[PDB]
């Protein structure tokens, strides 16, 4: 899955640490990803950087997988790719619909 090797896929951590660490990293785009327990794929933990007061709006998503080619994973409802990372790249170098889309891989 060459996912745990990227700059955002942790291990045995869980969105908890991702958020616990992402929410503490304070990086306008700090994100990670992990394969939950009952997940049919992997979940990404993203963390942006809000102006002020409002406070950061960190968030995570589960890269939904399908049965096409390539589109194998999707973190939205149309964003399907066979490369969570690419998908990540997509959710960063494209439109995106999640927390200011992917940006910075704060991979613990």
């Amino acid at each position: 899955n060459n996912l745990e090797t990227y700059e955002w896929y942790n291990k045995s951590i869980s969105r908890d640490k991702a958020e616990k660490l992402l929410l503490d990293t304070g990086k306008e785009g700090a994100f990670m990803v992990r394969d939950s327990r009952t997940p049919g794929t992997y979940t990404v933990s993203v963390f942006t950087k809000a102006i002020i007061s409002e406070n950061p709006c960190i968030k995570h998503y589960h890269i939904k997988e399908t049965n096409d080619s390539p589109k194998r994973y999707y973190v939205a409802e149309k964003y399907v790719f066979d490369s969570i990372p690419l998908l990540i790249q997509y959710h960063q170098y494209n439109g995106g619909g999640l927390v200011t889309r992917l940006r910075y891989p704060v991979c613990g």
Partner: peptide, 6 residues
Amino acid sequence: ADYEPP
């Protein structure tokens, strides 16, 4: 329901 539903 258990993961920020995109």
